[PDB]
């Protein structure tokens, strides 16, 4: 179809730009997309979970309970996981794999299909540096843009290649929106926002790169 | 992954499995056997299905 630019007050243009048929995918592969979402989710583990094993506890190795003449377990160890001394014999480990072998063709297919269906979702909005330079970094003009865009429950992202200082000074005082570089985005982050503005120039780069 | 050398020196992998090995009772000597068996034990052997399963996880 076509897509045009929205001004700071909400005045859409009268001359949209046609969307080339080379940016739409007729195939849907949710499994690579879901795996990308999982591997993005599999990045919030700092590996801080750990406990003292049987040999890692600082305690006496003597036998608290003698073998005979006692009506309790033998238990030649002072501290044990079933005891109230503390620690688990296995417990959490800080050496979890956190490793998933990638497929470049699958990754590219997932990336391009999520791009195409975001384009086909019609939530994409045109944007350019011509307005990125016209702002001052104050979120007040961003506030006018958002009340004009009337979209706050969905995070709004701006795939950017220049990253003007005025543009990036915003999107922080208003927690709803954010700005992200074109390549640095992720499928999980892309669907997390679900609202997105695209530069007019990067369409050709996205189409060619696939 | 390590391979148990204790076994693989006696068995060699072939196509589609069927690991090939030499027949026993002859490496030391075969002094009380008929020529029929000796020339028929000259042919090599392949481990059985359960033996194949045991070799497979062993290697």
């Amino acid at each position: 179809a076509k897509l045009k630019l929205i001004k700071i007050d909400g005045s859409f243009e009268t001359e949209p730009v046609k969307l080339s048929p080379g940016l739409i995918a007729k195939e849907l592969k949710q499994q690579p997309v879901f795996d990308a979402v999982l591997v993005e989710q599999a990045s919030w583990r700092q590996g801080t979970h750990s406990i003292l094993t049987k040999g890692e506890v600082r305690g006496g190795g003597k036998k608290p309970y003698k073998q005979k003449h006692t009506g309790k377990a033998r238990q030649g160890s002072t501290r044990n996981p079933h005891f109230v001394g503390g620690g688990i014999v296995f417990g959490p480990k800080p050496n979890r794999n956190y490793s998933l072998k990638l497929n470049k063709k699958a990754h590219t297919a997932a990336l391009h299909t999520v791009w195409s269906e975001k384009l086909a979702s019609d939530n994409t909005h045109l944007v350019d540096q011509n307005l990125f330079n016209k702002t001052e970094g104050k979120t007040k003009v961003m506030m006018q843009f958002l009340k004009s865009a009337k979209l706050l429950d969905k995070n709004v992202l701006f795939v950017v290649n220049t990253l003007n200082t005025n543009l990036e000074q915003s999107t922080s005082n208003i927690k709803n929106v954010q700005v992200k570089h074109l390549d640095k985005v992720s499928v999980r982050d892309l669907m997390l926002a679900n609202a997105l503005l695209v530069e007019k120039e990067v369409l050709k780069a996205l189409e060619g790169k696939f | 992954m390590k391979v148990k050398s204790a076994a693989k020196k006696r068995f060699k992998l072939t196509k589609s499995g069927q690991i090939k090995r030499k027949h026993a009772y002859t490496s030391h000597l075969a002094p009380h056997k008929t020529t029929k068996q000796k020339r028929h034990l000259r042919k090599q052997g392949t481990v059985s299905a359960s033996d194949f399963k045991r070799i497979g996880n062993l290697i």
Binding site: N194 | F11, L58
Partner: protein, 148 residues
């Protein structure tokens, strides 16, 4: 799939529970027999050990290698059936690197092999050649350079 919905289709299959009693199934029993050594933890005698019985490899002869301490030369075979799928003449290492055949940062000797009959004349370069392979290629009237 969204923030509030991440349903799968067929994944995250059923696992086993070994410590949730018998209302959950297979509790203390843990599906490992009873009162046996194989039932004990860290059991499962070696793949070559049969629990006192003599290992089979201990009763079998040991292979001897004439090429002991030495290894075969790495001749990469160019099977004629599959090399016929792609069409290309004046075949050389400069082309094989592009054709996903030979390494781009190393030199590897090559071998020609195959059993499919063709007729177009080509240009071929290998270090080893097979009888029926060369016969089939020469019936195609092509040129083969057995590198010497």
């Amino acid at each position: 799939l969204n923030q509030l919905k991440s349903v799968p289709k067929a994944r995250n299959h059923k696992t086993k529970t070994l410590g949730r009693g018998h209302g959950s199934g297979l509790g203390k029993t843990s599906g490992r027999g009873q009162k046996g050594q194989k039932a004990r933890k860290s059991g499962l005698t070696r793949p070559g050990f049969e629990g006192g019985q003599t290992p089979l490899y201990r009763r079998l002869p040991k292979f001897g290698n004439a090429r002991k301490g030495f290894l075969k030369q790495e001749w990469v075979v160019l099977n004629l059936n599959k090399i016929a799928k792609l069409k290309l003449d004046k075949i050389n290492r400069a082309s094989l690197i592009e054709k996903q055949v030979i390494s781009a940062k190393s030199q590897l000797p090559i071998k020609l092999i195959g059993h499919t009959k063709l007729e177009k004349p080509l240009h071929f370069e290998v270090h080893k050649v097979s009888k029926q392979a060369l016969k089939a290629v020469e019936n195609a009237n092509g040129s083969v350079k057995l590198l010497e």
